[PDB]
Design a protein around this ligand. Structure first.
Ligand code: CLA
Ligand code: CLA
Ligand code: CLA
Ligand code: CLA
Ligand code: CLA
Ligand code: CLA
Ligand code: CLA
Ligand code: CLA
Ligand SMILES: CC1=C(C#C/C(C)=C/C=C/C(C)=C/C=C/C=C(C)/C=C/C=C(\C)C#CC2=C(C)C[C@@H](O)CC2(C)C)C(C)(C)C[C@H](O)C1
Ligand SMILES: CC1=C(C#C\C(C)=C/C=C/C(C)=C/C=C/C=C(C)/C=C/C=C(\C)C#CC2=C(C)C[C@@H](O)CC2(C)C)C(C)(C)C[C@H](O)C1
Lengths: 154, 174, 178, 181, 42, 161
């Protein structure tokens, strides 16, 4: 009458809903399959999501390198934070929230780049194999195959 | 119903022979998982980018633009990347290629709808493909050169990783 | 009438070869006491978490995010060294994903209340890689086999990390018997 | 030739102390009525047939390579990095440390993953009616109508003989310390 | 397993004893591995 | 600090309690030979006493003039782990137990013989119910707002007034 873990509320005497929507087959790139309003997968389907992700990735690039770049006498550029940008007409609030308030990379010590990971925030790759081989190693490298071989030869 | 390229394997069902370069070559059945339009758009983009990168490696061995030698020094191939990241060149390149790739994303989704051929940006300002036959020959040549340049630029950059020469210096020096 | 995996035992009822990975292996009679839909959903969830977990236990040793807090090659050290607010964010986000992906039907009395809800079918196909009809059963078999293999591998990797105090690959390269 | 009932097929038993099982169909090349442990009753015959063929061809290439490398014949410049000795085990380790056998492993594994796995899977699933060991490889054109056997049967018999020969040669090199010939 | 023996095992005193022993064993093992927890550490 | 109490890591009477406990165990330790199992057991008890007093002294607990930790339970966040957070843990577990018991009672009402379900538990269904209890506050509140928790006063038996 009521199989364990069946998940049907009527078998457990639980208040059900009755209205159970059909499952449509339409799919969204960064969304989920499921019941939606009419017009939804045509206005916010995979095309809209991919376009908005593309536009967000494009607009990330000036946002990642956000700052006041000022040319010097030698033609070099000095980057200084938008937190030092002062405004004339808001009373005692000379410093105001800027785009760097919403994206505070330097507060966390994160060297952001237009491709997210920057020079001083580079992804660290190191080879775990320690420059030795799978078998027949003489030195500071004693692998599992070497352990098998030494166990057999004793 | 067997593959022409690999005669002991079946012809993949998503492959039909319509696309340029179709020889029934998909032994691992990648076209059964992904869309063939997405796959052809990806193949054309990888191939065109690799053709440009191969020609770039050859010409950057051959010569450099005025003033690049001062900023770069005696650095070739991927070794310039980091330097030109500290300089503003690669950021500007990424900005404008990202701007192009936004409309590339819209074009890819249009292709996935089925309103646009994969890799068809209708960019023929010199009207090279007047005849449909010339169009077919240029399509086959484009896909073949793109695949060849994919292999070529892979070889060039990994040979640079081994010797630090450059594709044309390595030929003239072992 | 006998189980194919275990030939000296009778074939378990409610196992009839319909599901992927069904070889008639249920000697303890879990499917005779609990519903197969919940068991399959749980098996797929444990397997998918273990796929991600085994892949992490191998990859995090080789590849790290920048920073001191992400520099632990051994995964049990990376559990403690990683920033705590980030891991609490991971917990909260997993909770929200579990809440919304099951569409507020999370329990043993209301998940599968909708007759269209299929075990392990959360509706997740971001790139629509399932658009092939004869591919489907082989795909589900490959997914459940990867999940079972990942469960066994990750269980072993955690307890061998406890025994050896070494990350898995560098334990295989610097092996010390007990 | 195909010699059904003399060299292959039903009714042929080369070792009559173990009777030929009823499970063997006689269609497979090399069927000479030898299955004492009754594996043919439960295994998939196409898979184990392809496995026998692959083990055999690998052992044939292994015998040819082992003999040509233990007698002393070498490619030009190949002695220098790989050692001027004749011992096959040290040749394996030297070519591993040089990287030669890594390249061999990479390319053989690439071939095996790219076409070998799909050929085995489509043969077993029943999508191509491909026979075991059939990779469609006849560049020089030696079997067209003589393909039934006197090509297949001699291939499997030489494969099995090469398997036994390579196993014997390896363990003799281990116990003696000297390569064959 | 006999269904009547399982039904006997499902009776209130047996399940009560098993569940309370299981709970007691949790409290005992938690206090064995983490003793003297007068407070939640914060 | 709070209510005139001092932190336990600087209270001299806390140290006196620790010293007295360690000395009381050490005078028992003195009568046994080194390496004997009573000696190892007593030394383990000494180690546990030292670790407990160290942990209590480094936890921000307040000690009174008696020398024992005193808990603050007025709601202040500097002592939220002494009553408030154990209270939240209890309330979660207790609401779990109440919710799964109520769910099993309402299931048993639907059976052929409800009282048999009360004395002979349907173990798979009960295990399903005890699994359901992890989201008991939201489930109980939705049960309340849908009119499925509270029953009206005209449907409950009452004595003559
Ligand atoms: C990102 C690449 C790059 C970089 C770093 C530079 C950098 C420089 N160029 Mg240059 N340049 C470039 C691309 C580049 N150029 C291209 C694509 C052209 C078009 C052919 C030129 C044409 C050019 C001219 C014509 C001159 C420079 C000059 C200069 C130098 C100014 C002093 C400076 C170092 C000047 C100089 O003195 O350099 C020799 C100069 O007269 N550039
Ligand atoms: C009209 C749009 C536009 C604008 C306003 C800029 C603006 C700038 N670019 Mg830029 N760029 C653009 C389009 C544009 N770019 C495109 C489409 C590309 C190719 C994807 C690039 C690639 C690029 C690189 C690689 C570099 C810049 C740099 C710069 C900066 C130079 C500042 C300076 O003092 O140089 C003043 C210079 C001049 C007044 C003379 C420059 C004349 C050049 C040599 C002519 C080049 C012709 C070229 C071959 C034609 C392009 C066709 C191509 C699409 C095939 C400046 C912010 C540089 C930078 O960031 O340095 C800090 C840098 O290294 N850009
Ligand atoms: C082997 C080279 C090659 C060939 C034969 C083609 C052929 C073609 N491309 Mg294509 N393309 C290529 C490389 C090539 N492409 C590369 C490298 C890029 C990236 C910049 C593109 C980007 C591109 C776009 C964006 C589009 C095409 C389109 C087309 C078609 C239009 C006909 C045409 O103009 O072709 C004739 C082309 C050639 C004869 C190539 C000239 C080679 C020059 C002379 C060599 C330069 C060498 C130099 C050092 C570098 C045709 C099938 C269009 C299409 O499909 O719509 C109809 C389209 O929208 N292509
Ligand atoms: C079971 C999964 C799991 C868990 C719990 C962890 C846990 C951790 N990882 Mg790890 N990781 C995993 C899988 C996992 N990993 C996988 C599969 C990869 C390969 C892509 C990595 C690669 C990785 C790197 C490179 C690093 C860590 C690091 C860390 C630590 C800090 C957190 C962080 O920065 O994450 C970073 C996480 C990622 C880069 C990728 C996580 C993506 C996961 C699998 C989520 C994808 C599924 C998601 C839930 C969507 C499904 C929804 C759908 C079902 C509805 C932490 C201990 C850092 C560390 O301490 O170094 C040792 C670090 O530097 N992880
Ligand atoms: C496919 C197998 C193969 C083939 C055909 C060759 C062929 C050749 N190798 Mg060679 N080699 C091989 C495998 C092979 N090798 C392997 C596996 C290694 C790794 C150790 C080497 C390492 C190697 C070196 C280090 C050198 C050669 C050289 C040579 C050339 C010398 C020819 C000559 O002057 O006659 C010589 C004939 C005799 C002395 C016999 C009398 C020749 C083209 C030499 C050369 O100049 O290459 C261009 C050279 O220096 N080889
Ligand atoms: C309602 C009354 C009440 C309350 C609130 C507590 C509360 C507590 N008791 Mg107590 N206790 C009680 C009645 C009570 N007890 C009764 C009636 C007895 C006699 C049977 C005991 C006998 C007793 C002992 C003997 C011990 C406790 C312990 C504990 C602590 C639990 C630590 C723990 O399990 O970490 C949970 C840890 C997790 C990881 C989860 C906690 C402060 C233990 C403790 O740590 O003391 C401070 C301990 O050793 N109690
Ligand atoms: C006898 C009545 C009484 C009651 C009911 C409370 C109740 C409370 N006190 Mg408290 N207090 C009392 C007497 C009382 N106090 C006395 C007599 C003192 C002096 C010794 C204090 C000193 C005291 C301090 C110093 C603080 C409290 C705080 C708090 C609040 C923390 C609980 C919480 O998480 O809510 C807050 C969270 C929510 C409402 C929602 C979270 C979900 C709570 C409302 C803390 C607070 O924040 O007060 C506002 C606090 O810092 N109390
Ligand atoms: C299903 C379990 C359940 C639930 C939800 C309630 C709910 C309630 N009881 Mg009640 N009660 C129960 C069982 C339960 N009771 C049992 C078994 C007894 C006999 C010992 C009592 C004896 C009792 C008294 C004497 C009083 C309450 C009171 C109350 C109310 C306040 C909460 C309270 O004081 O809890 C405290 C509850 C207890 C001390 C007894 C609980 C005994 C166990 C721990 C609970 C049963 C768990 C059960 C085995 C779960 C099986 C489920 C499984 C099969 C899936 C509330 C309406 C009080 C009231 O009227 O307040 C307005 C009150 O004065 N109850
Ligand atoms: C269509 C469009 C336009 C067009 C356009 C575009 C600009 C077309 C121009 C295209 C060029 C970029 C095609 C590039 C081909 C590169 C080859 C295949 C790579 C070869 C590598 C191999 C041989 C190798 C390598 C080797 C190894 C690995 C390592 C080295 O040590 C040695 C070596 C180098 C030998 C135009 C303007 C006409 C207008 C038209 O209306 C519309
Ligand atoms: C659904 C699909 C999605 C996809 C997705 C996801 C990302 C797919 C990825 C699935 C990945 C995570 C598969 C992971 C497999 C790991 C398992 C098989 C193995 C562990 C090995 C064991 C045997 C071991 C270990 C061993 C241990 C015990 C002892 C050691 O001494 C040795 C050793 C280490 C060898 C995407 C996003 C593409 C979108 C698409 O629209 C829909």
């Amino acid at each position: 009458a009521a199989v364990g873990f069946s998940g049907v509320p009527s078998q457990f005497g639980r208040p059900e809903s009755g209205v159970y929507p059909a499952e449509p087959s339409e799919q969204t790139f960064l969304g989920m399959r499921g019941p939606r309003a009419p017009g939804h997968r045509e206005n916010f389907g995979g095309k809209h999501t991919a376009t908005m992700l593309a536009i967000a990735a494009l607009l990330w690039q000036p946002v990642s390198e956000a700052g006041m770049y000022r040319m010097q006498g030698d033609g070099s550029l000095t980057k200084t934070s938008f937190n030092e940008f002062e405004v004339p007409g808001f009373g005692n609030a000379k410093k105001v929230p800027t785009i760097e308030s919403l994206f505070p990379f330097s507060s966390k010590g994160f060297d952001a780049s237009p491709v997210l990971f920057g020079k001083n925030s580079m992804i660290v790759v190191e080879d775990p194999r320690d420059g030795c081989g799978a078998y027949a190693n003489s030195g500071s490298c004693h692998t599992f195959l070497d352990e098998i071989g030494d166990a057999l030869k004793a | 119903a067997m593959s022409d390229s690999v005669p002991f394997l079946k012809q993949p069902e998503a492959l039909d022979g319509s696309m340029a370069g179709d020889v029934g070559f998909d032994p691992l059945g990648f076209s059964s998982i992904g869309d063939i339009n997405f796959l052809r758009e990806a193949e054309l983009k990888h191939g065109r980018i690799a053709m440009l990168a191969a020609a770039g490696s050859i010409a950057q061995d051959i010569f450099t633009f005025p003033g690049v030698s001062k900023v770069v020094g005696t650095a070739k191939m991927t070794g310039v990347h980091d330097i030109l990241v500290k300089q503003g060149a690669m950021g500007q390149l990424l900005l404008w290629l990202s701007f192009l790739e936004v409309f590339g994303t819209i074009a890819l989704l249009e292709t996935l709808d089925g309103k646009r051929a994969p890799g068809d940006f209708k960019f023929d300002p010199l009207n090279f493909s007047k005849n449909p036959e010339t169009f077919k020959r240029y399509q086959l040549a484009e896909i073949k050169n793109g695949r060849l340049a994919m292999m070529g630029v892979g070889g060039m950059v990994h040979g640079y990783f081994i010797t630090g020469k450059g594709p044309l210096e390595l030929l003239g020096n072992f | 009438a006998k189980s194919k995996a275990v030939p000296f035992l009778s074939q378990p009822e409610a196992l009839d070869g319909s599901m992927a990975g069904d070889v008639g292996f249920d000697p303890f009679g879990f499917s005779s006491n609990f519903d197969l839909k919940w068991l399959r959903e749980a098996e797929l969830k444990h397997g998918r978490i273990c796929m991600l977990a085994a892949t992490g236990c191998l990859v995090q040793e080789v590849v790290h995010l920048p920073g001191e807090a992400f520099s632990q090659k051994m995964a049990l050290n990376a559990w403690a060294a990683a920033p705590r607010g980030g891991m609490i964010s991971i917990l909260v986000a997993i909770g929200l994903i579990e809440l919304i992906s099951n569409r507020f039907a999370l329990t043993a009395t209301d998940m599968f209340a909708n007759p269209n809800r299929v075990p392990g079918d959360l509706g997740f196909d971001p790139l629509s890689l399932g658009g092939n009809g004869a591919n489907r059963a082989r795909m589900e078999l490959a997914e459940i086999t990867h999940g079972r293999a990942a469960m066994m591998g990750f269980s072993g990797m955690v307890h061998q990390m406890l025994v050896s105090k070494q990350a898995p690959i560098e334990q295989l390269m610097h092996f010390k018997a007990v | 030739l195909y010699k059904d009932g003399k060299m292959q097929g039903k009714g042929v038993n080369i070792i009559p102390v173990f009777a030929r099982p009823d499970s063997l169909d006689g269609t497979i090349p090399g069927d000479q009525g030898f299955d004492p442990f009754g594996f043919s009753s439960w295994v998939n015959m196409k898979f184990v047939s392809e496995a026998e063929i692959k083990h055999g061809r690998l052992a044939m290439l292994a015998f040819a390579g082992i003999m040509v490398e233990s007698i002393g014949i070498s490619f030009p410049g190949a002695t220098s990095i790989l050692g001027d000795s004749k011992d096959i085990f040290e040749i394996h380790n030297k070519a591993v440390e040089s990287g030669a056998m890594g390249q061999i492993l990479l390319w053989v594994g690439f071939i095996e993953a790219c076409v070998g796995v799909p050929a085995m899977n489509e043969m077993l699933s029943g999508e191509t009616s491909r026979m075991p060991g059939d990779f469609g490889f006849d560049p020089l054109g030696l079997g067209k109508g003589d393909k039934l056997a006197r090509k297949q049967l001699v291939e499997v018999t030489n494969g099995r003989l090469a398997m036994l020969a390579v196993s014997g040669i390896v363990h003799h090199t281990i116990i003696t310390g000297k390569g064959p010939l | 397993m006999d269904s009547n023996f399982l039904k006997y095992l499902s009776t209130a005193p047996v399940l009560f004893t098993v569940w309370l022993s299981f709970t007691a064993s949790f409290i005992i093992e938690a206090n064995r591995f983490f003793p003297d927890m007068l407070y939640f550490p914060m | 600090d709070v209510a005139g109490l001092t932190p336990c890591g600087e209270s001299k009477e806390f140290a006196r309690r620790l010293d007295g406990s360690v000395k009381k165990l050490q005078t028992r330790l003195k009568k046994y030979e080194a390496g004997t199992p009573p000696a190892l057991a007593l030394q383990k008890q000494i180690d546990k006493t030292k670790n407990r007093f160290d942990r209590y002294g480094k936890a921000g607990l307040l000690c009174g003039t008696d020398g024992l930790p005193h808990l603050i339970a007025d709601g202040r966040w500097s002592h939220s782990g002494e009553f408030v957070i154990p209270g939240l843990f209890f309330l979660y577990v207790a609401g779990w137990i109440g919710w799964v018991g109520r769910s099993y009672v309402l299931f048993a009402r639907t059976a052929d013989k409800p009282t048999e379900k009360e004395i002979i538990i349907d173990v798979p269904v009960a295990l399903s119910f005890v699994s359901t209890g992890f989201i008991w506050p939201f489930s109980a509140f939705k049960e309340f707002t849908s009119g499925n928790l509270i029953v009206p006063a005209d449907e409950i038996t009452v004595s003559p007034r």
